[PDB]
Amino acid sequence: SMDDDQVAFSFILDNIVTQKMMAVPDSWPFHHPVNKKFVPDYYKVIVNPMDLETIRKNISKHKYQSRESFLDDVNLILANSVKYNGPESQYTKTAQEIVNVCYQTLTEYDEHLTQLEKDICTA
Amino acid sequence: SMDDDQVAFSFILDNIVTQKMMAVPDSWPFHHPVNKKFVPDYYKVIVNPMDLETIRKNISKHKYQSRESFLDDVNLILANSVKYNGPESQYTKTAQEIVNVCYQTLTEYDEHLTQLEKDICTA
């Protein structure tokens, strides 16, 4: 893209993913789409899969103009884990830690992200 | 109760529910047990219902001595929504905002809550 406000917004989101979310201990199973060779029934159970690589690909294509659409996809990782792995699964706890570091970092960056969202919107 | 550490702990939890969780936009359907008159099959699907009023009643009776038991009931609200509404439902997104703001507020009060939990345990 050529709009610096959008590029900057996407860059901030990408670093939330790589610096914070992917740093959660044992988070690797959420870094990429579920591998059907190891989890053979995953895509028969989960209608709308989501993972951090897919989110990063969306960021690289500037598909998030607001934090809410980005957070919606992050939240879907957890919701899918509740459904597939179970509400109390070790994997679900890890997914919630991923969500928590994302949500809390977005809160940290609130003033800066608000400014970018309004400058992406005006254009 | 007559134990000030327990009363203070419950008071803090109660304000997380009323000041943050119940302030989530459009969260009213989670404020009370699901009304079977509008959702007639709810209690045939959901074996362990949970809602914010029930959690507040538990808090008033000092049933939570630690964040973990409190979070177990908070997360159950989300688990029930994933099962009944689905991982991508608007209602599940609302439940996730409730859960996410709860974790974020607990982190903000972490030093205060850790001290109270450790003083409740000694007795």
d(CA A74, CA A56): 11
Integer Cα distance of A43 and B44 in angstroms: 27
* CA–CA distances in Å: residue A93 to residues A41, A70, B108: 21, 20, 20
Amino acid at B120: I
Solved using = X-ray
Q: Yes or no: say if B96 and B74 are a contact pair by the CB < 8 Å rule.
A: no
Nearest-by-CA chain A residue for B90: A72
- Determine the 3-state secondary structure of A99 from DSSP: helix
Q: Which residues have C-beta within 8 Å of that of residue B86, sequence separation ≥ 6?
A: B92
Residues 32-61 of A with CB under 8 A from B: 46-48
A122 token code pair: 């005006």
Nearest to A106 by CA among A64, A49, A60: A64
A108 has a chain B CB within 8 A of its CB:
no
Tell me whether B98 touches chain A (CB under 8 Å).
no
Instruction: Answer for the pair B21, B98: CB distance below 8 angstroms, yes or no.
Output: yes
- CA separation (Å) from A11 to A7, A14, A16, B31, B75? 6, 5, 9, 37, 31
Question: What is the DSSP code (8-state) at residue B24?
Answer: S
Residues 6+ apart with CB under 8 A from B105: B16, B20
Distance from CA of B79 to the nearest CA of A (A): 6
A78 at the B interface (CB within 8 A)? Answer: yes
Q: For residue A68, what are the contacts with CB-CB under 8 A and spacing of at least 6?
A: none
Contacts of A80 in chain B (CB under 8 A): 87
CA dihedral A44, A45, A48, A53 (to 10 degrees): -90
